[PDB]
Design a protein that fits this description.
Chain lengths: 339, 56, 286, 207
């Protein structure tokens, strides 16, 4: 049998990979940014408190204009909010109440949903006939849909619970490209600012960087020891941060191919649920299962602030494109806008 | 079954092996440079005045 | 005073020397018990309470607690002032407030008692939380106020509203203003008592389906705990008022009525809140 | 403002559907493959939602088990359920070992620390004849006691109820399913109406 030889060949490749990373591991960003002044204690107040959901809020997505906000709840209703005036614009009656993700198109015309129903539903907001309708119903995933993001009005990438990410074409409703390689259930994905390459975190404690045009895993990052739940790129696009079930946020560099920072504290023992970056990337916001968020300095790993004020586990959060405010949706059916 | 998976798995490592890796310190400086370049364009970092704050 | 006057047409002279000591201690610790009960409740009023049904009980408990505290301080100052030096300045005002607040306390326990009956037989019937809150305040305060105003608008012009010995509603033989307090007190207790038995039947329901006996004496300990906490909050200790009405000369009934009801503040902090394991651990640690 | 009036209209629809969904029982259905779940759901892809109305009460049942993924990553969304319906196939013997493990996992979740179980022992009619062909005592390493149905059936209940570590906060309801289905839906309603009655006692500080 040649299986034993192949495993040995794979094993020595992993040793070469870690040795190559160890060569550049001598320098650490923690000891480099000691000269820069710390951001200090930062305060954020709930400018708005969006309410109206009748169940736990699992996902939200900010609008491309930093004004509209879409959130999904287990009540079966998808609501597009007007963050400036707290008003409500739409309320979609999702066919399946088990929704776990929602995306808002960069053109502001489409909203996507998915969850335990094993399908991705896309709704046309700009309908000339009045009420919104299900534009397309993407199907083909054998596992629960964990995340979905819009590349453009005709391209969407979905993270499923079948250890497989896929790229879909809305016009034909077929998987243009299928991404495989994860040995665990994929939980989240993030798109680069140029929407060319994306990285997804799975339950195998590994984050893999993919190429949309090709459909191959360019890089693999293994720094966690538990399930990875949050993925977010740096604004530059050359780095990203991961949130896991160990209360640890790790910053990985695409070019260096190695973990740089480890944002963790002794007090926190819960798991990360969502992470986000500011416009400048200096401030890192991470959700937590201990009923409140945290603010981390992305260059010094110092807890700059706390976003307490939620009565249940924080399930989702996001920062606007203009970086004017940060929203947060917890399990207490309340959305809060912080600034 | 498992033989095919092993053949494909070892090919992925070889493709990932022959990639260009820059020094961490060089990559670390790029992250710090980006934060300093866009520090003034971060309303969260610098308290925005209520006059121009849309959420005031 | 003896604290029996609330339900006693006449207080025998032999009980007064011995009954006054226990009630003053009982009223004294009742004031302290209510202060701690309100303080601990105020801090954790909404931090841990989120259920819709639990929302109604919190407002009922503070209303019962608030009524007892202010009524007790009105009662203690209503018996320590002479009825001749200030027959209207401090004596007349205290009697009306004491009578009205006690009526509000009795009527609030009816709302709590009806609430338990509502969630037991009408398990699937759901009204709005605000609608239940509005009707509870209307009957909790408005109904005692309706009875209170007519008490001072009928007996007072006849100059039979004041007992000579103590600042409290007179008994007399022709005019009986005390019936405006005795009758509602027994009516609430009687309505609360059938509510008590309704809870007992639900705890004693037979096994559903083919379930085995499994644990033994598990239901009986719940019954003992339920009566321990439900009795003071429902004012079941006020049922002795009928005993002092009929005879008003028994040595034992005046003692038990005084000690149990004067200690009701202690039976609220120790049994209503401390016995509740949901809030017991959250308070002892810090 | 037209936008403000639009929000007010949306709010009415949200509350109108909220009170409609507030009367839904929202049960959860579990069990082994081909473990009689079809009979308990059809008496009248991922998870399937089935609705039946009994005594002016609408019930929702979610047949979890078709996901075939990491259950702990999506089992927290099935909280606030009235109870858990479990189906055990008494006729099958090899599937009983995995059924106990599945029952063990669901009852010990941190989310399901208070939800009751209305487990159903299905195929009791076929268990009478099948036990004669293969005795329960011989098939299992553990002793099954007397070969009579009055003790063998009760032995299965002992092996299932003892898996519940939270005896005080959980009330397991057991029933045997037969060919008739008129009383099958009655037990679910009786078990559910007992749970909500009991649940009010904890919220009222009585239980
Ligand atoms: C402030 C806080 C708040 C307060 C609390 C309380 C209030 C109110 C009370 C109540 C409420 C209302 C009532 C309901 C009834 C109905 O509707 O329905 C009846 C029939 O169904 C009849 O029923 P029967 O069975 O006949 O009986 C009944 C009796 N009870 C007692 C329940 C009344
Ligand atoms: C269940 C326990 C703890 C509390 C019971 C409280 C009530 C129901 C009790 C306490 C005192 C009792 C009274 C005591 C004496 C008499 C005189 C006679 O005519 C028999 C009935 C009557 C009038 C009783 C009626 C019931 C009563 C009012």
């Amino acid at each position: 049998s040649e299986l034993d030889q192949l495993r040995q060949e794979a094993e020595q490749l992993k040793n070469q990979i870690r040795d190559a990373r160890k060569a550049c591991a001598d320098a650490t960003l923690s000891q480099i940014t000691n000269n820069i002044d710390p951001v200090g204690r930062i305060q954020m107040r709930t400018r708005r408190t969006l309410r109206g959901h009748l169940a736990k809020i699992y996902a939200m997505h900010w609008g491309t204009d930093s004004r509209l906000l879409v959130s999904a709840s287990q009540d079966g209703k998808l609501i597009i909010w007007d963050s400036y005036t707290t008003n409500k614009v739409h309320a979609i009656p999702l066919r399946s109440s088990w929704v776990m993700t929602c995306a808002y198109a960069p053109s502001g015309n489409y909203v996507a949903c998915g969850g335990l129903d094993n399908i991705c539903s896309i709704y046309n907001l700009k309908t000339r006939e009045g009420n919104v309708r299900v534009s397309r119903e993407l199907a083909g995933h054998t596992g629960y849909l964990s995340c979905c993001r819009f590349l453009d009005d005709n391209q969407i990438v979905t993270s499923s619970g079948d250890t497989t990410c896929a790229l879909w074409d809305i016009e034909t409703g077929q998987q243009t490209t299928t991404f495989t390689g994860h040995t665990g259930d994929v939980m989240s994905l993030s798109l680069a600012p140029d929407t060319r390459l994306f990285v997804s975190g799975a339950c195998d404690a590994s984050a893999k960087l993919w190429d949309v045009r090709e459909g191959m895993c360019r890089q693999t990052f293994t720094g966690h020891e538990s399930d990875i739940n949050a993925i977010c790129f740096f604004p530059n696009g050359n780095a990203f941060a991961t949130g896991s079930d160990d209360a640890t946020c790790r910053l990985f560099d695409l070019r260096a191919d190695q973990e740089l920072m480890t944002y963790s504290h002794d007090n926190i023992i819960c798991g990360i649920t969502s992470v986000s970056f500011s416009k400048s990337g200096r401030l890192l916001l991470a959700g937590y299962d201990d009923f409140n968020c945290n603010v981390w300095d992305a260059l010094k790993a110092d807890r700059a602030g706390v976003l307490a004020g939620h009565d249940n586990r924080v399930s989702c959060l996001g920062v606007t494109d203009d970086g004017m405010a940060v929203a947060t949706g917890s399990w207490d059916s309340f959305l809060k806008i912080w600034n | 079954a498992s033989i095919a998976q092993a053949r494909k798995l070892v090919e992925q490592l070889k493709m990932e092996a022959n990639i260009d890796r820059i020094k961490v310190s060089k990559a670390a400086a790029d992250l710090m440079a980006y934060c300093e370049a866009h520090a003034k364009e971060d309303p969260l970092l610098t308290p925005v005045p209520a006059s121009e704050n849309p959420f005031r | 005073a003896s604290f029996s006057i609330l339900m006693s047409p006449f207080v025998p002279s032999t009980i007064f020397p011995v009954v006054k000591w226990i009630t003053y201690v009982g009223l004294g610790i009742s004031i302290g018990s209510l202060i701690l009960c309100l303080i601990i409740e105020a801090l954790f009023w909404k931090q841990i309470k989120k259920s819709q049904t639990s929302h109604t009980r919190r407002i009922c408990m503070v209303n019962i607690a608030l009524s007892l505290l202010i009524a007790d301080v009105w009662f203690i100052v209503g018996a320590t002032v002479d009825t001749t030096v200030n027959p209207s300045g401090v004596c007349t005002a205290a009697v009306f407030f004491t009578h009205f607040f006690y009526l509000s306390l009795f009527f609030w326990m009816l709302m709590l008692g009806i609430l338990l009956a509502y969630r037991i037989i009408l398990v699937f019937h759901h009204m709005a939380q605000h609608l239940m809150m509005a009707v509870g305040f209307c009957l909790g305060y408005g109904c005692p106020l309706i009875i209170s105003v007519i008490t001072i608008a009928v007996t007072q012009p006849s100059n039979t509203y004041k007992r000579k010995d103590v600042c409290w509603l007179n008994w007399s033989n022709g005019s009986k203003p005390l019936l405006a307090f005795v009758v509602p007190a027994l009516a609430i207790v009687a309505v609360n008592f059938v509510v008590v038995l309704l809870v007992l039947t639900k705890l004693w329901r037979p096994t559903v389906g083919e379930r085995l006996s499994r644990d033994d004496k598990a239901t009986i300990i719940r019954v003992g705990k339920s009566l321990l906490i439900l009795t003071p909050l429902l004012g079941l200790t006020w049922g002795f008022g009928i005993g002092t009405i009929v005879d008003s000369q028994n040595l034992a009934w005046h003692v038990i009525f005084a000690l149990l009801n004067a200690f009701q503040g202690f039976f609220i902090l120790c049994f209503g809140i401390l016995l509740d394991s949901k809030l017991r651990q959250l308070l002892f640690n810090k | 403002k037209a936008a403000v009036e639009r929000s007010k209209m949306i709010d009415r629809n949200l509350r109108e559907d909220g009170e409609k969904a507030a009367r839904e029982v929202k049960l959860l259905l579990l069990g082994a493959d081909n473990s009689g779940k079809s009979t308990i759901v059809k008496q009248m892809t991922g998870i399937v939602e089935t609705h039946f109305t009994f005594k002016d009460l609408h019930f929702k049942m979610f047949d979890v088990g078709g996901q075939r993924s990491e259950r702990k990553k999506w089992i927290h969304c099935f909280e606030d359920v009235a109870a858990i319906i479990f189906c055990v196939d008494l006729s099958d013997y090899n599937r009983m070992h995995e059924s106990m493990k599945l029952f063990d996992s669901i009852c010990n979740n941190k989310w399901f620390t208070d939800t009751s179980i209305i487990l159903f022992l299905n195929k009791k009619d076929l268990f009478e004849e099948k036990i004669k062909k293969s005795p329960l005592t011989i098939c299992y390493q553990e002793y099954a006691g007397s070969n009579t149905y009055e003790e063998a059936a009760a032995y299965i209940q002992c092996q299932f109820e003892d898996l519940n570590k939270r005896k005080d906060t959980k009330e397991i309801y057991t029933h045997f399913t037969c060919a008739t289905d008129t009383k099958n839906a009655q037990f679910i309603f009786d078990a559910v109406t007992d749970v909500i009655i009991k649940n009010n006692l904890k919220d009222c500080g009585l239980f």
